[PDB]
Design a binder for this molecule. Structure first.
Ligand SMILES: C[S@@+](CC[C@H](N)C(=O)[O-])C[C@H]1O[C@@H](n2cnc3c(N)ncnc32)[C@H](O)[C@@H]1O
Length: 205
């Protein structure tokens, strides 16, 4: 099955051979999950034209402004190495399986945020399914989302700190789904951000 990608304002099917040729031509494939307006993904594409930068978000309309920009000629802000895909991470199409050298989840919200905080299987499986073995997962959550008014998707959950990553069982759920936690830290810029890094391996018990 072909991927559903933005070309400017319209959803299209990506030729499976063009997708394959694009991956092989790249020095690294970065999959940015929940890319939002995709401006961060576009910046990365522009700074590393040797990377294939794949932004994944179900809310595809929000990405269209960046897509229009990425599709212009090179001299006018074009980024042909940026591929934006309409999909939710938990139902990620087969053509995205095993592609990524690096998976980033930067300031998620909604299902993606609750999923990573709880370690929901469907979200963590989807994230794992897009990674090559050995790829890093890099998650950043701003801890100010836990100050009032707290958003609905994490209202009922205690604030995620290095200590609760452990005591809620989140490193164990990660391990059961093929993610080995390599590092967690809180970085004070000034909003404090929680960073979690894991590496794609075989599932454990
Ligand atoms: C504001 S954005 C973050 C933008 C970007 N990551 C950044 O640099 O700040 C949060 C995104 O996570 C996305 N999201 C929520 N649930 C998701 C899911 N299940 N799969 C993929 N993305 C999802 C939302 O649609 C939203 O666009």
């Amino acid at each position: 099955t072909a991927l559903k990608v933005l070309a400017g304002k319209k959803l299209t099917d990506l030729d499976p051979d063009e997708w394959a040729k694009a991956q092989a031509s790249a020095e690294r494939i970065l999959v940015d999950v929940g890319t939002g307006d995709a401006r961060t993904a576009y910046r990365q594409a522009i700074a590393h034209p040797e990377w294939l930068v794949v932004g994944v978000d179900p809310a595809w309309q929000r990405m269209t402004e960046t897509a229009v920009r990425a599709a212009r000629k090179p001299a006018k802000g074009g980024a042909p190495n940026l591929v934006l895909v309409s999909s939710a991470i938990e139902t990620v199409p087969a053509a995205l399986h095993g592609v990524a050298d690096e998976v980033m989840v930067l300031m998620p919200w909604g299902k993606l945020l609750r999923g990573v905080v709880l370690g929901e299987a469907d979200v963590l499986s989807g994230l794992r399914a897009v990674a090559k073995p050995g790829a890093p997962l890099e998650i950043s959550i701003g801890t100010s989302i836990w100050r009032e008014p707290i958003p609905l998707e994490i209202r009922d959950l205690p604030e995620l700190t290095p200590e609760t990553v452990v005591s809620t069982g989140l490193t164990d759920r990660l391990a059961a789904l093929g993610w080995q936690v390599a590092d967690v830290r809180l970085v004070p810029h000034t909003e404090t951000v929680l960073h979690l890094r894991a590496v794609a391996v075989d599932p454990r018990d």
